[PDB]
């Protein structure tokens, strides 16, 4: 948690918002972990249901995607082929710890 600057934003929201965006952010981070090879698993729509109604109005939620290596573009938030898997568990963990 308070070790990583973003998940330090994160959970400064109230209990029920904080599990929710959490809950969804380590579904993310699993479903690469879990087939680091396939590419689906590596981007999100930034206009997903999820997405829109569950971390981008939550303080600290879209920072988290981007200490875990998930970077912006128009209309994707995409995790690179080169990006640390090491460094997307380690976030993944510091997450976790909080709830």
Known sequence: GS????????????????????????????????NPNDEAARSIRIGNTAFSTRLLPVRGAVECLFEMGFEEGETHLIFPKKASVEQLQKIRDLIAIER
């Open 3 to 34: 070790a990583s600057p973003a998940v330090a934003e994160l959970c400064q929201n109230t209990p029920e918002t904080f599990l929710e965006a959490s809950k969804l952010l380590l579904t993310y981070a699993d479903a690469i972990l879990r």
